[PDB]
């Protein structure tokens, strides 16, 4: 199983290496900056007394951790090997899986929270407390641990043509458990989230569109337009950012694709797109949040 290491040669064109490096740098910087800024604004001004700010905080920390892995990944790309040893391999793999799932589970959570508010307003009174939002973040972290902790054990460095792969070792037979892992990641990080947010937001919109009021009404149309557009944006961003790397990982499980510049470049691009979700989340879920918006 080839993980961090791409079977490469012949060694790349100047322009493709500058491109890929620049890609990893920009995403890392923008991700770290946007998410630290959210954390700062929360800790300083808004304070975390509300459920929505507790979810925002959790999302930003996960997104900041996700992006924190990128410099390790640029060097690994630039050098064509993993130079950081076996301990850092475990730690970075682990952080990377944990926070992919935290990020994604928290953003699902925010969708479910909104569906609950509109479709179950009475239950929303019990669900939308700071206490529950903390319990939910712990539950999501538990769920994330089902993959985050095993990878900590499975991750290791090994030799692979003189060079060093930071990879996952699996029990026997490797071809079962390695493909199960890929499958699970694909369904819990992609399929299930896409279903959750599209169903929750689509049911939310449906309830909203069903409301009458003898007077209304142009105001109601107007509101629905703004909400619908926001739903379409957050879903479309999720899909554009995450679908490429997910599909690419499955395709590689199934067929053998010719090593080429296009293959190498597209792969890093798809990887960067994943981390771009973590860059856009602050915009989508903090800076455009009704209450958070108001500061400063």
């Amino acid at each position: 199983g080839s993980h961090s290491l791409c079977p490469q040669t012949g060694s790349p064109s100047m322009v493709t290496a500058i491109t890929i490096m620049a890609l990893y740098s920009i995403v890392c910087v923008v991700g770290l900056f946007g998410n630290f800024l959210v954390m700062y604004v929360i800790v300083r001004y808004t304070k975390m007394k509300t459920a929505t700010n507790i979810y925002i905080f959790n999302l930003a920390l996960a997104d900041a951790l996700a992006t924190s892995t990128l410099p390790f990944q640029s060097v690994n790309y630039l050098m064509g090997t993993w130079p950081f040893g076996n301990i850092l391999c475990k730690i970075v793999i682990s952080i990377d899986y944990y926070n992919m799932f935290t990020s994604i589970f928290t953003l699902c959570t925010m969708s479910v929270d909104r569906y609950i508010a509109v479709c179950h307003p009475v239950k929303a009174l019990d669900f939308r407390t700071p206490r529950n939002a903390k319990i939910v973040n712990v539950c999501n972290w538990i769920l994330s641990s089902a993959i985050g902790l095993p990878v900590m054990f499975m991750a290791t460095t090994k030799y692979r043509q003189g060079s060093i792969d930071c990879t996952l070792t699996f029990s026997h037979p490797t071809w079962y458990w390695e493909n199960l892992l890929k499958i699970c990641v694909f369904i819990f990080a992609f399929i299930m989230p896409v279903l959750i947010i599209t169903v929750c937001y689509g049911l939310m919109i449906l309830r909203l569109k069903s409301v009458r009021m003898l007077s209304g009404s142009k105001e109601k149309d107007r509101n629905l337009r703004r909400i619908t557009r926001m739903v379409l944006v957050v879903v479309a961003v999720f899909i554009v950012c995450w679908t490429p790397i997910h599909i690419y990982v499955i395709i590689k499980a199934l067929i053998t694709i010719p090593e080429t510049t296009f293959q190498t470049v597209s792969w890093h691009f798809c990887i960067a797109l994943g981390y771009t979700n973590s860059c856009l989340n602050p915009v989508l879920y903090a800076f455009l949040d009704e209450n958070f918006k108001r500061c400063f």
Partner: nanobody
Amino acid sequence: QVQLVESGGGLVRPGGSLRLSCVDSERTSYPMGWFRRAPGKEREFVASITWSGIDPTYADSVADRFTTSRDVANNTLYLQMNSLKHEDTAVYYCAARAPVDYDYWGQGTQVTVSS
């Protein structure tokens, strides 16, 4: 014109819970806010919520304990008050917007926190 019916107030023990609700059944306005006035004090903001029911806003002194929701299908506003304290003893007023500050105010309900 508009007539806001507030329910669910009254007497609770310290640390207890109450659920207020408010409706304009005529669908002539949208109950969206809660204010209160303690004896001797000025009217203060408690909570509000957008039209859609998605986004609540809480006063700092109540954020940890109060939740608000809106039932957009029957135009009902709720306030769930937990862990009640002497500080929460007040007349609570529902506030509503016209479909076209707030435009309408309930006559209020007494919430009394006492042993």
